[PDB]
Amino acid sequence: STAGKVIKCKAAVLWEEKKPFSIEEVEVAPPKAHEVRIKMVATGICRSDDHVVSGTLVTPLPVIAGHEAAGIVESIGEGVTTVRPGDKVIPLFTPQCGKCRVCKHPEGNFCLKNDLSMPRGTMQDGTSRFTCRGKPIHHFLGTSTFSQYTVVDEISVAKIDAASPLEKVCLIGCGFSTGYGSAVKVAKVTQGSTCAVFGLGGVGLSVIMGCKAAGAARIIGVDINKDKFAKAKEVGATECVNPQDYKKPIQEVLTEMSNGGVDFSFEVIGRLDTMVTALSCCQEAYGVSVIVGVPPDSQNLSMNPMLLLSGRTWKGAIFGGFKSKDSVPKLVADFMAKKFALDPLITHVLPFEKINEGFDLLRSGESIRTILTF
Amino acid sequence: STAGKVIKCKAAVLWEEKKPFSIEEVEVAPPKAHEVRIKMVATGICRSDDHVVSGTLVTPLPVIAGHEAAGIVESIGEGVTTVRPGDKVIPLFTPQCGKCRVCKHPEGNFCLKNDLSMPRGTMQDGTSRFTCRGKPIHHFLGTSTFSQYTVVDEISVAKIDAASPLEKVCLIGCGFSTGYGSAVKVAKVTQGSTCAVFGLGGVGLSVIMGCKAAGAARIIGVDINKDKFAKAKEVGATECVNPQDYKKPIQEVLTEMSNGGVDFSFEVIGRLDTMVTALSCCQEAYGVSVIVGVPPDSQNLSMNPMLLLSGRTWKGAIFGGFKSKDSVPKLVADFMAKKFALDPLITHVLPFEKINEGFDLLRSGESIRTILTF
Ligand SMILES: NC(=O)C1=CN([C@@H]2O[C@H](COP(=O)(O)OP(=O)(O)OC[C@H]3O[C@@H](n4cnc5c(N)ncnc54)[C@H](O)[C@@H]3O)[C@@H](O)[C@H]2O)C=CC1
Ligand SMILES: NC(=O)C1=CN([C@@H]2O[C@H](COP(=O)(O)OP(=O)(O)OC[C@H]3O[C@@H](n4cnc5c(N)ncnc54)[C@H](O)[C@@H]3O)[C@@H](O)[C@H]2O)C=CC1
Ligand SMILES: OCc1ccc(Br)cc1
Ligand SMILES: OCc1ccc(Br)cc1
Ligand SMILES: [Zn+2]
Ligand SMILES: [Zn+2]
Ligand SMILES: [Zn+2]
Ligand SMILES: [Zn+2]
């Protein structure tokens, strides 16, 4: 009955960097051809949304952020074939158009229609479905989930299991899938290996889940916040180290612990120095290091190419290397089948209008994932 | 008739950086336990030997350099089991001890007994078998092939086919195996792919041969010396580009030519800037870039980690990823069965005594490989 009409609803608008989110009355346009309007049910607070606030991650402002979510389709634009009204869906911050060179490649997942490489903060058609007091508000990675309703391109939404618990499976829209995929698909962690995981937030915990599932014998968590260690150990870390405890660099510590370097290292923080440390701590001849952390805007790292010439492999990935539309439904089905657990990532559940409390919890170190419910 | 005796013979000693080789009389000690004394038959001039002269590659001086060679066992020390006097052999600049965690790993080839990481310029026992003007002279990578006779540890030599032509198969000791392996083993180049090869010296031409053997559709040779193009085209390059002919940076040209980036790129020069350019020109979601070139001592490159976060893989390797002692005899067997060609890499043959003309041919851009004969 809202189909074909403007919806007036509340959304959390970020007007300016380094300011609180502002709960505003917005108008959400109806979906145009090949667009889907979604009623949000749950959205997760991911450190990448905080990067927008901090200016680490540049995207046009003002913006409705939020990219880790699950909802129900309220209506569909002309030509939509992959979802219908009433369907449970997860928005895909990495699209899967199915037609570009990457979508056709067996391994690649970074679809050329993504709004990550050179963010415009629009729909695919280069316009916005959001207005606040006459002013257009930017989209974020084609998702924009910090709103009661959003509009996404059909290539940026997957239908999921009609019985799935949206307050849990929203994590499959980013943090779980990124971390788990980084281990099982990108690194391809092997049985009996030694893994080091830098950063023990939601995404690093999911890296640990991935390494345990892949049969790693040793999984060393690294965090400057020792409060993170207990939960890292619960999901499979065999050991945890705090670099602040040591009078020498942690790559030397991890090299001695691993008897000459780890098989697999993961940077899951977003700092240039830990990207180089994670590479250095993997074994010089056959080690693999995966960058998961989003670096600070426009900054270059410095590294010695002899770390690679010896044999190391260095790679990164978006969304755990998962082809998003193909994988997100299968990951939900796997969750429904008890193949992995999401409750260990969820430390707080707040109503949407307490979003700023949700971000305060993240910034303080006290949360892993806060889920915002509608 | 020389067994158990000190040999007096000619060697090319490097006394000082940025000086000509000095062809003079040296004393070569007989082999100790698990050592092998070799009469050199042929040695190639590799750019890495020139890096020792220029100080780009640091190793203790004074030194007998050379690492790409073939010869005949003159005598063996006590306990040697894998070669006998009169055997044809190729010295291994990357050893294969068979005992260490790398030698036991299925992918690893950078044996922990190597003298590359932290060069000492000795035998495994920390002493030298060379005297000149009554001074001890350093070894180079446990090989030292710029001498009529050398002594190597048993883990640094492979027995090859008794009928092999040593004046060709010396190239399997470095440049051929390194390039070819970088393509077929390290990159694992796929059928129907697009490859970019930066540098069309002996190692780059070898990378092209591996790219053609792997069934690459397109192989784009890149070099600032257009005199290199003809030979590159003969051994499988489909196109050759000189960066100096374009206004745009060559990563931009290759990305255009490949309709969004190459599948596989190779840095086969040894410059920081071309290592980053080669990484950039591989497709951002699934490209693989392999560093082969030896960078200047102790220098860091600067790069944007968003190149990796999109999904690129960056790696490097020594000796094309080959387990040296397992691989080198198989590579000689494959050569004898004409599975690959070495003649295209050999542009000049000179007597050993003309080593300095050898280096001048390389430095001028005129040669690919000069083979020195003893
Ligand atoms: N590649 C991708 O597709 C994705 C990237 N990310 C990124 O992954 C990273 C992690 O995200 P979350 O787990 O949500 O963040 P989070 O902030 O919950 O976790 C980061 C952890 O790193 C630790 N840390 C900070 N500085 C450290 C240091 N110097 N040394 C060791 N530990 C340090 C913190 O104590 C914290 O526990 C972020 O950069 C985020 O933007 C998130 C999802 C998708
Ligand atoms: N990783 C390993 O195990 C091995 C490494 N190497 C290294 O591989 C590299 C190549 O060795 P070779 O083929 O013997 O050397 P080479 O000097 O014959 O060939 C290098 C080629 O690169 C070209 N070049 C120089 N600057 C260039 C630029 N800015 N752009 C494009 N091309 C440029 C030169 O014109 C030349 O044709 C060297 O750094 C050498 O030390 C060699 C053998 C083993
Ligand atoms: O967490 C979402 C996200 C992932 C990667 C980048 Br780059 C930006 C945002
Ligand atoms: O070409 C011989 C050699 C290869 C790699 C390095 Br590093 C140094 C020398
Ligand atoms: Zn696509
Ligand atoms: Zn996220
Ligand atoms: Zn070894
Ligand atoms: Zn060489």
Side-chain angles (χ1 to χ4, degrees), chain B residues 11 22 25 33 63 104 129 146 148 157 168-170 176 212 217 223 227 236 250 264 288 294 301 315 341 355 372:
Chain B
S22 179
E25 177 164 283
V63 72
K104 290 182 183 322
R129 293 287 168 277
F146 295 165
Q148 289 173 327
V157 70
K168 320 270 202 196
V169 298
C170 53
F176 171 76
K212 179 164 159 224
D223 203 303
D227 294 351
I250 191 73
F264 302 93
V288 174
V294 170
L301 65 74
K315 62 208 290 178
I355 187 168
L372 305 173

Side-chain angles (χ1 to χ4, degrees), chain A residues 10-121:
Chain A
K10 295 175 193 180
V13 173
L14 182 75
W15 293 106
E16 203 171 358
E17 67 168 29
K18 297 161 164 282
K19 301 304 172 181
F21 293 94
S22 182
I23 305 295
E24 306 281 0
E25 175 173 274
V26 303
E27 305 190 57
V28 185
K32 306 190 187 159
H34 305 285
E35 294 173 7
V36 178
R37 180 156 81 174
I38 301 171
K39 185 181 183 177
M40 217 62 56
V41 176
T43 184
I45 290 169
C46 169
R47 179 65 70 168
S48 301
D49 304 298
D50 186 54
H51 289 345
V52 172
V53 176
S54 74
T56 297
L57 180 62
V58 179
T59 194
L61 308 183
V63 63
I64 296 177
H67 64 282
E68 178 178 275
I72 298 160
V73 177
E74 167 271 347
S75 73
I76 62 175
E78 205 194 339
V80 170
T81 62
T82 57
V83 304
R84 302 171 189 186
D87 280 358
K88 285 181 182 176
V89 290
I90 289 176
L92 312 173
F93 76 81
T94 302
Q96 183 171 5
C97 78
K99 305 198 153 161
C100 71
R101 188 141 70 94
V102 177
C103 289
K104 277 131 55 73
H105 192 284
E107 308 284 69
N109 74 325
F110 198 43
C111 176
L112 289 190
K113 293 302 191 165
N114 78 79
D115 192 45
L116 275 90
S117 285
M118 294 209 197
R120 293 188 301 166

Side-chain angles (χ1 to χ4, degrees), chain B residues 129-353:
Chain B
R129 293 287 168 277
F130 297 124
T131 307
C132 189
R133 308 187 181 195
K135 300 170 213 175
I137 308 301
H138 289 99
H139 296 251
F140 181 48
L141 309 180
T143 59
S144 290
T145 71
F146 295 165
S147 179
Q148 289 173 327
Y149 292 81
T150 190
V151 177
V152 307
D153 291 288
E154 185 174 17
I155 64 169
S156 295
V157 70
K159 177 177 178 197
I160 63 166
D161 203 301
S164 23
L166 296 183
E167 68 287 0
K168 320 270 202 196
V169 298
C170 53
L171 294 189
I172 291 169
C174 183
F176 171 76
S177 300
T178 295
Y180 197 77
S182 293
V184 308
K185 194 148 205 301
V186 179
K188 303 159 164 65
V189 163
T190 56
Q191 190 190 325
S193 63
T194 299
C195 294
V197 181
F198 289 76
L200 303 175
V203 185
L205 293 174
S206 302
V207 169
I208 294 160
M209 288 177 188
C211 287
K212 179 164 159 224
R218 304 181 62 189
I219 301 167
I220 301 164
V222 180
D223 203 303
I224 62 168
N225 183 349
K226 75 172 188 297
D227 294 351
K228 300 293 174 182
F229 290 3
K231 179 57 67 53
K233 300 194 83 178
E234 297 168 24
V235 302
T238 59
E239 293 172 278
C240 285
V241 308
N242 176 357
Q244 302 181 336
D245 293 344
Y246 296 87
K247 297 197 191 147
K248 291 181 167 120
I250 191 73
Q251 68 254 33
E252 196 174 340
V253 176
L254 295 164
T255 295
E256 284 182 8
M257 290 179 75
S258 60
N259 306 309
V262 305
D263 298 282
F264 302 93
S265 65
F266 298 86
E267 200 279 11
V268 205
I269 309 167
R271 292 168 68 79
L272 299 183
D273 62 352
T274 45
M275 290 168 189
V276 183
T277 288
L279 174 63
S280 299
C281 85
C282 83
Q283 201 283 331
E284 71 181 352
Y286 55 82
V288 174
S289 188
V290 181
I291 306 183
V292 181
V294 170
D297 182 75
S298 301
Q299 294 198 23
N300 280 21
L301 65 74
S302 158
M303 59 84 73
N304 186 340
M306 282 304 310
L307 289 179
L308 300 172
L309 200 77
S310 50
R312 292 184 178 85
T313 300
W314 206 5
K315 62 208 290 178
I318 307 302
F319 197 54
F322 285 123
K323 287 181 188 282
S324 59
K325 191 152 187 171
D326 287 340
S327 298
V328 159
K330 187 47 158 50
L331 287 156
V332 170
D334 293 340
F335 174 68
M336 296 296 290
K338 315 208 177 76
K339 294 315 157 176
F340 53 89
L342 296 173
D343 287 346
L345 309 175
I346 301 167
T347 58
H348 299 77
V349 178
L350 291 172
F352 178 58
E353 292 82 11

